[PDB]
Structures are given as structure tokens and as C-alpha cells.
């Protein structure tokens, strides 16, 4: 096995923050469910509890950052993830055409309660848009998330 790098820990801390919307340092079923539903899934409360239980090392019913890190190491360790990123792309690509448009991005962010300004949306698209077509394809999305 390979020990987690400080760059990976930082990336995962940023990922954890997206789930931990109240910043209380834990991810609850409510928080996990909110994210899942936002990605088009329809889990039941029983399913959500089971999902947390799997990674909940201390049995307190929620996921803390250390538990999240163990989970991410496993995801990277087992095979090499990949499905995670594909399903995420599909959430953003609302019309399923293979490209995330600025409108689609803004719609997702607004739904997630992030009322981005026009300038903020433009910056997200410009930075991900390596080929310059004004939208974000799958490879560009992977590169943006893949991170170093």
C-alpha cells in the first residue's frame, strides 16, 4: 500500500467540505442524502444509514474526516476508482450530450445552493475548458478533478 500524500489530503479535505455543509466536521445521513439526491439518485433512509455504517469506524452514526480519508484511500487503492468521476460528470451534464455547458453548471451550482455570480461561472468554465470550445467535455472534467 501507499501512504496518502499531503496534496491528496488537501484535495480530499476540499471534497469533504462539499458534504459537510454545516462545517461541523461530520457527514450525516442528511448531508449524504442531500448530495446523492442532487446527483439524481433516490436512496432510502435505510440505504443512507447502511452507506455511512460501512465507513463509520467508531459507530457514532456519522463520518468524520479521518474516516473519510480511510474511505478515499480504499477507493484509490481498490482498482483505481473511476466510476465516481463518471457518475459525477453525468450529474452536471443534464441533457446528456457529452458536454457540460455554462448553463448546466450554473443550474447545478444554484441547486446546490451556491448562487454563483456571472463572473464566477465564467471562471469555472474557462479554467476547465482546455480545448476552447466554451464547454467542458469528459476529459476536461477528469483533468479538473483528477488533480495532482
Amino acid at each position: 500500500a501507499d501512504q496518502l500524500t499531503e496534496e491528496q489530503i488537501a484535495e480530499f479535505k476540499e471534497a469533504f467540505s462539499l458534504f459537510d455543509k454545516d462545517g461541523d466536521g461530520t457527514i450525516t445521513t442528511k448531508e449524504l442524502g442531500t448530495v446523492m439526491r442532487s446527483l439524481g439518485q433516490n436512496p432510502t433512509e435505510a440505504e443512507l444509514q447502511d452507506m455511512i455504517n460501512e465507513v463509520d469506524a467508531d459507530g457514532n452514526g456519522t463520518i468524520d474526516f479521518p474516516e473519510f480519508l480511510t474511505m478515499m484511500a480504499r477507493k484509490m487503492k481498490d482498482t483505481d476508482s473511476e466510476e465516481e468521476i463518471r457518475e459525477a460528470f453525468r450529474v452536471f451534464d443534464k441533457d446528456g450530450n457529452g458536454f457540460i455547458s455554462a448553463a448546466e453548471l450554473r443550474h447545478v451550482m444554484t441547486n446546490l445552493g451556491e448562487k454563483l455570480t456571472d463572473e464566477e461561472v465564467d471562471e469555472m468554465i474557462r479554467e476547465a475548458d482546455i480545448d476552447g470550445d466554451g464547454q467542458v467535455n469528459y476529459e476536461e472534467f477528469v483533468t479538473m478533478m483528477t488533480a495532482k
Binding site: 462539499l18 453548471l105 447545478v108 479538473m144
Partner: peptide
């Protein structure tokens, strides 16, 4: 700043916990 990453990654964590279920085929 405009990192669709924390947003994507985050969803990646949960999305991964949904697929971790190694096909409940049986």
C-alpha cells in the same frame, strides 16, 4: 475559486459509496 472539484470530488465520495455495493446480483 471556480473549482468544480470540491463539488465533483464531494459527489464522488457519495457516488462511490453507492457503487461500492459490489453488484447485489444475488
Amino acid at each position: 475559486k471556480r473549482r468544480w472539484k470540491k463539488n465533483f470530488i464531494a459527489v464522488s465520495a457519495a457516488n462511490r459509496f453507492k457503487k461500492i455495493s459490489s453488484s447485489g446480483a444475488l
